[PDB]
Amino acid sequence: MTLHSWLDRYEKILASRGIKQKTLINYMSKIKAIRRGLPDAPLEDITTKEIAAMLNGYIDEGKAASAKLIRSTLSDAFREAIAEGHITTNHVA
């Protein structure tokens, strides 16, 4: 299971959660930011360092709300991948 494949699956989990329309749109945009920001690599191969480099691009520019939400979205994606058995720990922590 690689990241971009997992994001595909995570979009479907989000669709079934029953989230307000405005919120879901925001969530989908931040998934797009993740796809753009990180490689289509096996979940365990995504490093701390790569996560920090994506997030820091936003932070450096003053994009504080975005960096918070990208981080939170990725974390939750990783938690869903744990629930589905593809990894055993969450690296966004």
Could you tell me which CATH class the domain 1-93 is placed in? mainly alpha
Cβ(44)–Cβ(87) below 8 Å: yes
Cβ(73)–Cβ(50) below 8 Å: no
78 Cβ contact partners less than 8 Å away, ≥ 6 residues apart? 43, 87, 90, 91, 92
Domain ranges of the chain: 1-93
CA nearest neighbour of 3 among 67, 58, 51, 52: 51
Q: What method was applied to determine this entry?
A: X-ray
Annotated resolution, angstroms: 2.0
The region, left, alpha or beta by phi > 0 then psi within -120 to 50, assigned to residue 20 is: beta
